[PDB]
Amino acid sequence: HHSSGLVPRGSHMGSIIDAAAAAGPVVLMETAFRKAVESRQIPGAVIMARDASGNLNYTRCFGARTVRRDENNQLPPLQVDTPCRLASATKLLTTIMVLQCMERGLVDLDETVDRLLPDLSAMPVLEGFDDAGNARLRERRGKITLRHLLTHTSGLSYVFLHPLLREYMAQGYLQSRLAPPAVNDPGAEWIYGTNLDWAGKLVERATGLDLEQYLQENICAPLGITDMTFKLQQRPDMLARRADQTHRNSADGRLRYDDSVYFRADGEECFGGQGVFSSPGSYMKVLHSLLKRDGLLLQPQTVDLMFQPALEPRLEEQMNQHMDASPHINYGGPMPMVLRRSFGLGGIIALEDLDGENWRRKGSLTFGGGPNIVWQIDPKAGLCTLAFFQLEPWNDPVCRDLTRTFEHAIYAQYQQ
After folding, report:
1. Is 317 annotated for ligand binding?
2. For a designed S-S bond to 351, which of 106, 228, 340, 397 qualifies (C-beta 3.0 to 4.6 A apart)?
């Protein structure tokens, strides 16, 4: 029956099991994350989801911020306030900074870059190599605009992603992030490149501030953020709490400490393409503000611009062909390998629902950062999410599958 003065509860095995409701999608998903840490498949992860109303405010942290044991022989935890390497997840931040410049009348999105970036405008385009093996450089056809930089349609490419630039370096021409030539004319094709390093310079020259100061005054201060910087070396408090980078060795699949240059040398320039260190918590504050249309970073109408397909049909088609054919690069992370996409300002836009009413909707904006960081904002679902790992290389199957599982679970329980 029931014990006097005691709350009625399960008193035998059948009634105890039934008194506990079965595990929903989110609980099962958290178990998968815990098992991945337990079995040493990942170092750790922070996953976060918010809606606009405040009824969804979900943050879970799993595992360690490193594989190196600390002074007490332990593996310290990855936390919501742990300083993490954002790498290309910096690009959303720089895009916002550019758009603020536009809002304040310092720049027009369709103005040529020649005025503020004459060093960019003077750069030639690498057409190829002659029979001898000499670089064939020529003058650009048309002008690069600010909007070309923001949409990666300027003709600029990262060296390692283009065969012309790889051979350009192989023949000793590059002996600098800004040095290599363009590989096409502006408007010709979508090409992932150093566009936000250039856009960052444009912000510095338009405002007379370095990007760090601009960042602090215009993104961090308005959101109460104190864990986001280009200058990690000058923040000893952040430096001591920071994540180490981990690398998965392609042979045995084991996790190893990754001793790479971005943690010892700040470098003197602020690079708008990859330079920011931020906690997951602070990055979510940016995403959430954009979701809320709260005017703290940008006017609602300007945020709406970021989610509009920027590409005319020819470029949309070319980008989708390139992305569908490039799952080895996989810009979209957990998104389906084949999907109709466009590019907005700040990321890739889904032009169709990912899985009907079960997952991200048409109009959602997304991108990633190198060490398996994935962010997305989905105005129709009323959700934004991030999955922060500190594990290289990009597109790690375990991280991608865990990230999918996370998003699926959150959408299944909390999408509205």
Report:
1. no
2. 340
Count of helices and strands (H, E) across the chain: 14, 15
Q: Measuring CA to CA, which residue among 269, 265, 100, 286 is closest to residue 198?
A: 269
Our CA angle for 83, 89, 95, nearest 5°, is 120
Contact 391, 248 (CB under 8 A): yes
**Pairing mode of beta strands 391-392, 245-248:** parallel
Of 195, 193, 188, the residue nearest 142 (C-alpha):
188
Cα 339 from chain centroid (whole Å): 19
| Distance (Å) of CA 24 to CA 55, 100, 150, 360, 385 | 18, 42, 40, 19, 19
Q: How far is CA 269 from CA 7, 214, 220, in A?
A: 64, 13, 19
Structure tokens at 243: 């994540």
1-416 maps to CATH 3.50.50.60:
no
10 Å CB burial of residue 236 (0-12, 13-18, 19+) is exposed
CB distance 152 to 196 below 8 Å: no
Structural determination approach: X-ray
> 194-210 burial by CB neighbour count: b if 16+ within 10 A, else e?
bbbbbbbbbbbebbeeb
Q: Is 370 annotated as a binding residue?
A: yes
248 has binding-site annotation: no
262 assigned to a ligand binding site:
yes
Q: Quick one: which of 214, 384, 410, 373 has its CA closest to 284?
A: 384
The answer to whether 192 is annotated as binding is: yes
- Name the residue type at position 26: V
Proportion of the chain in helix, strand, coil states, percent, rounded to 5: 35, 15, 50
Catalytic residue numbers, as ranges: 88
Name the token pair of 262: 């971005």
Domain segments of the chain as ranges: 1-416
411 in a known ligand binding site:
no
Closest listed residue to residue 92, CA positions, set 264, 287, 352: 287
Find the angle CA(274)-CA(368)-CA(106) to the nearest 5 degrees: 55
**DSSP 8-state symbol, 139:** P
- For 279-339, list the strands marked E by DSSP: none
Question: Radius of gyration of the chain from Cα atoms?
Answer: 23
Alpha helices in 208-293 (DSSP H): 211-215, 221-223, 236-241, 280-292
CA pair distance 379, 384, nearest whole angstrom? 8
Closest CA to 354 of 373, 376, 322, 370: 376
Contact 369, 393 (CB under 8 A): no
33: three-class secondary structure by DSSP: helix
